[PDB]
Amino acid sequence: GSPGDSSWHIYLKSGTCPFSFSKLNNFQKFKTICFSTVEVPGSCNFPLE
Amino acid sequence: GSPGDSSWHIYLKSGTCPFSFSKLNNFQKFKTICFSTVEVPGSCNFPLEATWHYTSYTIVGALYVTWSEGNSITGVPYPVSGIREFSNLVLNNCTKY
Numbered sequence: 307g308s309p310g311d312s313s314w315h316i317y318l319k320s321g322t323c324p325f326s327f328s329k330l331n332n333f334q335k336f337k338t339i340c341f342s343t344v345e346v347p348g349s350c351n352f353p354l355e
Numbered sequence: 356g357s358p359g360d361s362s363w364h365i366y367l368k369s370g371t372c373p374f375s376f377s378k379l380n381n382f383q384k385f386k387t388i389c390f391s392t393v394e395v396p397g398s399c400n401f402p403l404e405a406t407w408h409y410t411s412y413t414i415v416g417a418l419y420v421t422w423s424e425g426n427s428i429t430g431v432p433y434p435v436s437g438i439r440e441f442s443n444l445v446l447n448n449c450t451k452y
C-alpha cells in the first residue's frame with residue numbers, strides 16, 4: 307500500500323542476446339519467438355538485478 | 356508397428372559448436388571427444404526439435420560434446436573392414452583430395 311519499494315531499485319541488465327529489451331517495440335522483424343522464464347536449451351537471457 | 360511417426364518430424368538443429376554434426380564423418384582431426392547426454396561444465400550443444408507438419412516448433416533435448424585440439428583421432432565415412440592400413444587413391448579424373 308505505502309510504497310516501501312521507494313528505496314529498492316529493481317531493473318534489467320543487458321545479457322548475451324544480440325538485441326536489446328527496450329528496443330523490441332521498434333520495428334524489428336523475426337520469424338518466431340516464444341518467451342519463457344524457465345531454462346530451455348539454446349536460449350540467451352536478460353538478468354535481473 | 357504402423358508408423359504413426361509419419362507426420363512427426365524430429366531432427367537436429369545447429370547449436371553453438373564450431374563444427375557440424377553431419378560433417379564429423381569427414382576427415383576431421385581431434386585429440387579427445389567424450390560425448391554425453393547430461394550437463395557437463397564447459398561443453399557446447401546441439402538442440403533437438405519436434406514438430407507436426409512444420410506448423411509449430413518445440414525443443415525436446417540436446418546432445419553435449421567436449422573436445423580438445425590435436426592430430427590423433429580422425430573421423431571416417433564408413434567402417435571398411437579387413438584393411439590393415441587405411442588409404443585410398445583415385446587416378447585420372449577429378450577428385451576431392
Ligand SMILES: *[C@@H]1O[C@H](CO)[C@@H](O[C@@H]2O[C@H](CO)[C@@H](O)[C@H](O)[C@H]2NC(C)=O)[C@H](O)[C@H]1NC(C)=O
Pocket residue numbers: 307308309310
Ligand atoms: C510502516 O508502518 C505503517 C504503519 O505501522 C505501515 O502502514 C500500513 O501497514 C500495514 C501492514 O504492514 C499495511 O497493510 C497497510 O497497507 C499500510 N498502510 C498503507 C497506507 O499502505 C507501513 O506499510 C510500514 N512500512 C513498511 C512495512 O515498509
Ligand SMILES: *[C@@H]1O[C@H](CO)[C@@H](O[C@@H]2O[C@H](CO)[C@@H](O)[C@H](O)[C@H]2NC(C)=O)[C@H](O)[C@H]1NC(C)=O
Pocket residue numbers: 356357358359
Ligand atoms: C490405429 O489403429 C490401429 C488398429 O486399431 C493400430 O494398429 C495396431 O495398434 C496396436 C495397438 O496400438 C499395435 O500394437 C499394432 O502394432 C498396430 N498394428 C500395426 C500393423 O502396427 C494403429 O497403430 C493405430 N494408429 C496409431 C496408434 O497411430
Ligand SMILES: *[C@@H]1O[C@H](CO)[C@@H](O)[C@H](O)[C@H]1NC(C)=O
Pocket residue numbers: 447448449
Ligand atoms: C571417372 O571417375 C569415375 C568414378 O565414378 C569412373 O567410373 C570413370 O571410369 C572415370 N573416368 C572417366 C573417363 O569417366
